């Protein structure tokens, strides 16, 4: 499968190619910004050290 695009990026099925997620800022004209995942919950570190 060609859908193994990492985070901070997306893949546009329309254009038929993977791009970046940083592109999804202001100008909205891509149906790939839905690929850009945000998994890996940051708020998950017990104790209040460091």
Alpha-carbon distance of 46 to 12, in angstroms, equals 38
Pull the structure tokens for residue 2: 């060609």
10 three-class SS: strand
Total domains in the fold of the chain: 1
- Asked if 5 and 35 count as a contact pair (C-beta separation under 8 A), the reply is yes
Residue 36 contacts residue 28 (beta carbons within 8 Å) = no
The technique is NMR
List the CATH number of the domain containing 41: 4.10.400.20
Q: Contact, 38 vs 24, CB < 8 A?
A: no
Buried b or exposed e, range 4-27, using 16+ CB within 10 angstroms:
ebeeebbbeeeeeebbebeebeee
Which helix (H) or strand (E) segment is 19 a member of? strand 17-20
Task: Please say whether the dihedral angle defined by the alpha carbons of residues 22, 33, 7 and 15, taken in this order, is positive or negative.
Answer: negative
Note down the domain range covering 47: 1-50
Question: Would the CA dihedral through 18, 21, 22, 27 be positive or negative?
Answer: positive
């Amino acid at each position: 499968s060609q859908g193994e695009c990492p985070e901070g990026r997306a893949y546009s099925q329309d254009l038929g190619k993977c791009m970046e997620c940083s592109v999804c800022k202001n100008s909205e004209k891509s149906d790939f910004c839905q690929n850009c995942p945000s998994k890996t919950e940051q708020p998950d570190f017990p104790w209040i050290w460091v």
